């Protein structure tokens, strides 16, 4: 062993055949059961190069999650490439479960155990495994939810920091909990999210410090909201209990040197721009009754302005391959012998 290689991975999960939650249903027919006693072979003094930005695992995961969504969250109407696709659009139970990605016989997965690994180049503390850790396929913009935390300090990753067109992925080391609700009272499409103001402020400060560490210690770090675009990437958008939330993130991303809970106003939308492909999807009205999500903010997607002393950063996202990237960064598939 071994050699960096490409093969068709398979997925494993602890999905329950009796749960009608759609990730479970999908995973029940799509995945095999997890190993209760998973094995790890530590190669403590072996160095291996990684490139999270060129990782086929992401592409495969992307495919899988497209399949999952296309089977699980069926829109009443889909507008795509001159076609109108209509189908039964039941409101369903929707709550992501962890998915493990596994190398078939003849192959193994390399895991980087360097705790400050910037996602590209050499990794010195590597181990070999059959499967990745459980990755929750959360589809969102701006904020990464319910993901894995940095073990030590905050870590920021970019394919190329000096290139302002390349997305910056922030991995926090402390979760910031965000509670989003469509109150049942009314306006069934009116929702909101609450989170701790001071935790968020300190999170921004620590991210700012880490950004200066990268772009220069004399540089003033500023956060501004999105410059514009589709509602999905201008707002913090996500799916909570099968409903599509669009939350105004101005209060999250307006910050410079200069209440208790931050309350973000949100709308539940029925007519969505799709992440899987270019077009629209139209869903049935919000369910009455409880719509409620509590999530760990565990990461961020940022873009940098670029172009005199000051650096402005804005919330980004849109390419979900980055979301998968935020979790698969420490992995690569290899062939044994």
């Amino acid at each position: 062993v071994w050699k960096e290689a490409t093969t068709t991975l398979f997925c494993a999960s602890d999905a329950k055949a009796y749960d009608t939650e759609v990730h479970n249903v999908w995973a029940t027919h799509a995945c095999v059961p997890t190993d209760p006693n998973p094995q790890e072979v530590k190669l403590e003094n072996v160095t291996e190069n990684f490139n999270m930005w060129k990782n086929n695992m992401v592409e495969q995961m992307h495919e899988d999650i497209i399949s999952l969504w296309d089977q699980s969250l069926k829109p009443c109407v889909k507008l795509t490439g001159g076609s109108v696709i209509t189908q039964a659009c039941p409101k369903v139970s929707f709550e992501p479960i962890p998915i493990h990605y596994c190398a078939p016989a003849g192959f193994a997965i390399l895991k980087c155990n360097d705790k400050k690994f910037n996602g590209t180049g050499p990794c010195t503390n590597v181990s070999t495994v059959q499967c990745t850790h459980g990755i929750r396929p959360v589809v969102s913009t701006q904020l990464l939810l319910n993901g894995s935390l940095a073990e030590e300090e905050i870590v920021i990753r970019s394919e190329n920091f000096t290139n302002n067109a390349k997305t910056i992925i922030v991995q926090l080391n402390e979760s910031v909990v965000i509670n989003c609700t469509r109150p049942n009272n009314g306006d069934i499409r009116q929702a909101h999210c609450n989170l701790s103001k001071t935790q968020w402020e300190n999170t921004l400060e620590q991210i700012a410090i880490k950004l200066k560490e990268q772009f220069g210690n004399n540089k003033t770090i500023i956060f501004n909201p999105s410059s514009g675009g589709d509602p999905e990437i201008v707002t913090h958008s996500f799916n909570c209990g099968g409903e599509f939330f669009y939350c105004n993130s101005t209060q999250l991303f307006t910050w410079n040197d200069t209440g208790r809970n931050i309350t973000l106003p949100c709308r539940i939308k029925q007519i969505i721009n799709m992440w899987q492909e270019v077009g629209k999807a139209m869903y049935a009205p919000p369910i009455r009754g409880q719509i409620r999500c509590s999530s760990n903010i565990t990461g961020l997607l940022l873009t940098r302005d670029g172009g005199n002393g000051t650096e402005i950063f804005r919330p980004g996202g849109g390419d979900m391959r980055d979301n998968w990237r935020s979790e698969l960064y420490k992995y690569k598939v290899v062939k044994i012998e």
Epitope: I188, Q190, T250, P265, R267, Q270, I271
Partner: nanobody, 123 residues
Framework: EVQLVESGGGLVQPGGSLRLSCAAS????????IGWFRQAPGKEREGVSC????????YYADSVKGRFTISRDNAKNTVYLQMNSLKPEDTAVYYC????????????????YGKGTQVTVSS
């Protein structure tokens, strides 16, 4: 194809009235929030009015409350906005929109809308 056919509007003296209509092909309006928002050139979006669901729940921007009335004809799949007691600051382009909202902090979530109907209020 899905589309929104707007009509009505124009020019009136302050305190006059207009009626806007938006006819939707492609939906059943009572399955959506449908309504109007407005924008004047060089100015930010402003909320106006939304109608919603089977019982036709209605929502109004504070600035138009009591003056504007939104209603729905299910058979014609059409929504109407009766604009009374018009004031000069009501001058704007009114856009009929799906996923309609009147919340001042969420007006730019509306990206699926039916292009201008101009309303101008002047003496």
């Amino acid at each position: 194809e899905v589309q929104l056919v707007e009509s009505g509007g124009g020019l009136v003296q302050p305190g006059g009235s207009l009626r806007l209509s938006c006819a939707a092909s492609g939906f059943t309006l009572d399955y959506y929030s449908i309504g109007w928002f407005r924008q004047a050139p060089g100015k930010e979006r402003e909320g106006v009015s939304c109608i919603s669901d089977s019982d036709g729940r209605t929502y109004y921007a504070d600035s138009v409350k009591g003056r504007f009335t939104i209603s729905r004809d299910n058979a014609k799949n059409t929504v109407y906005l009766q604009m009374n007691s018009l004031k000069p600051e009501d001058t704007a382009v009114y856009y009929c929109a799906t996923d309609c909202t009147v919340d001042p902090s969420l007006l730019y979530v509306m990206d699926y809308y039916g292009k201008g109907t101009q309303v101008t209020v002047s003496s």
